[PDB]
Amino acid sequence: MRVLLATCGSRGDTEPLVALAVRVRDLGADVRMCAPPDCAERLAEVGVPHVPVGPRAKPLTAEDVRRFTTEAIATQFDEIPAAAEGCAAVVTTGLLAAAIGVRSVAEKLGIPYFYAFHCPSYVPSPYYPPPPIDIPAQWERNNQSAYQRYGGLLNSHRDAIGLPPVEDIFTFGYTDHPWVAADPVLAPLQPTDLDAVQTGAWILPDERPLSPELAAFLDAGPPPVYLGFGAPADAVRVAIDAIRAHGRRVILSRGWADLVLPDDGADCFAIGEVNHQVLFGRVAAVIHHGGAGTTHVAARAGAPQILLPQMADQPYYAGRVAELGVGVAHDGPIPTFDSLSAALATALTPETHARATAVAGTIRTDGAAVAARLLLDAVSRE
Ligand SMILES: [Mg+2]
Ligand SMILES: [Mg+2]
Numbered sequence: 001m002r003v004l005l006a007t008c009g010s011r012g013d014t015e016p017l018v019a020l021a022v023r024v025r026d027l028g029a030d031v032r033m034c035a036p037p038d039c040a041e042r043l044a045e046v047g048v049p050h051v052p053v054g055p056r057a058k059p060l061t062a063e064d065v066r067r068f069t070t071e072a073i074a075t076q077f078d079e080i081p082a083a084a085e086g087c088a089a090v091v092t093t094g095l096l097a098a099a100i101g102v103r104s105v106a107e108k109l110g111i112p113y114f115y116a117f118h119c120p121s122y123v124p125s126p127y128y129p130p131p132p133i134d135i136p137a138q139w140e141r142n143n144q145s146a147y148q149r150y151g152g153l154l155n156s157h158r159d160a161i162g163l164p165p166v167e168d169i170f171t172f173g174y175t176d177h178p179w180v181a182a183d184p185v186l187a188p189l190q191p192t193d194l195d196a197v198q199t200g201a202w203i204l205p206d207e208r209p210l211s212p213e214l215a216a217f218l219d220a221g222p223p224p225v226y227l228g229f230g231a232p233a234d235a236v237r238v239a240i241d242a243i244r245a246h247g248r249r250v251i252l253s254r255g256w257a258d259l260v261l262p263d264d265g266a267d268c269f270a271i272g273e274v275n276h277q278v279l280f281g282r283v284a285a286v287i288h289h290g291g292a293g294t295t296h297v298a299a300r301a302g303a304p305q306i307l308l309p310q311m312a313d314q315p316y317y318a319g320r321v322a323e324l325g326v327g328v329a330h331d332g333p334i335p336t337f338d339s340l341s342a343a344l345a346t347a348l349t350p351e352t353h354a355r356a357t358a359v360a361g362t363i364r365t366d367g368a369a370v371a372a373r374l375l376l377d378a379v380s381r382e
Helices: 011-026 037-045 062-083 096-109 134-160 169-174 212-219 233-245 292-301 314-324 337-347 350-362 367-380
Strands: 002-006 030-035 050-052 089-093 113-117 225-228 250-252 268-270 285-288 305-307 327-329
Touching: 002 011, 002 062, 011 030, 011 037, 011 089, 011 292, 011 367, 030 037, 030 062, 037 050, 050 062, 062 096, 062 134, 089 096, 089 367, 096 113, 096 134, 096 169, 113 169, 113 367, 134 169, 225 233, 233 250, 233 337, 285 292, 285 337, 292 305, 292 314, 292 350, 305 314, 305 337, 314 327, 327 337
Parallel strands: 002 030, 002 089, 030 050, 089 113, 225 250, 225 285, 250 268, 285 305, 305 327
Antiparallel strands: none
16 A cells, blocks of 8 residues: 655645655555655655655746646646556645645545645634634635635646536645644644544654764853744844843854854854754754744754744744743744844743743654554545
């Protein structure tokens, strides 16, 4: 029995599916993953068969957006059929435009399709509004909006392969039994009329040791603050100013090695490839945008967090960090010296550290295995 894992390419979508792939294989099943050519390296690391699929100087226009949409859907119909050859099921996450194409191909082949969310707030429900009679209407409104953008294209493609038209994009793309690949403590699934199942995040343990240089920097002083931002150089410089004002050194995520600094930058260490699972257990706090993955890794590592949400599910995770008392939900998406200094004052307290440490022990790490089991049992019901 072989399972197909389909992904658009983002590391945020790719890694969780890689985790599921490995856990499904751990159970004796075969796996194959369709992803951008650039995922070849990572997939080679875990020995997961890779089917390369899918992928400026001028502003974007509505015409451009419509083209990315049209081609996102077409790519699924054009390449998933071959990738799904010899497969008993297909699992995907992410972009709705792509997901509806993947499910349509699964439907044509007569194999079960599964969808997973990385944030529970995106799961349709009549009990809470969608990411910003009434509530239901709100979700239907967005669902109608999705149809206006994808419906015509989807059904045109479906006509070509003899499948009936879809009228409800959300139910079709997400299914009425979506999985929520997020931790039940960090991101609790809320009431809904859908048969959603919360498995825990899909993350594999990272065994890579820290580089000798990074380790040496860490041992050369008190635990530093990790700054992980893309972002404007001035925003990073302000963040560094605030961290320094709290007497802490800085670890800069990959990409800032050449950032120009005001005062001597000897207290700033810029890293390349790194084991975040381990690094996060050695810092005083982590400052980032609030993506599902980073928030989960930092939470399990017990690191106090400061989130500056920008898009998608980031505002959700920023809110959860504040509610759990393991960090601060920074107001704006860009920091100022005063706003970040205020956040650090709260995040660096012994109380916040104790809380982050306690919560960390309750974050589960077997979510991918949980999903793998549910998947195989479902496939066995076919
Ligand atoms: Mg093509
Ligand atoms: Mg038609």
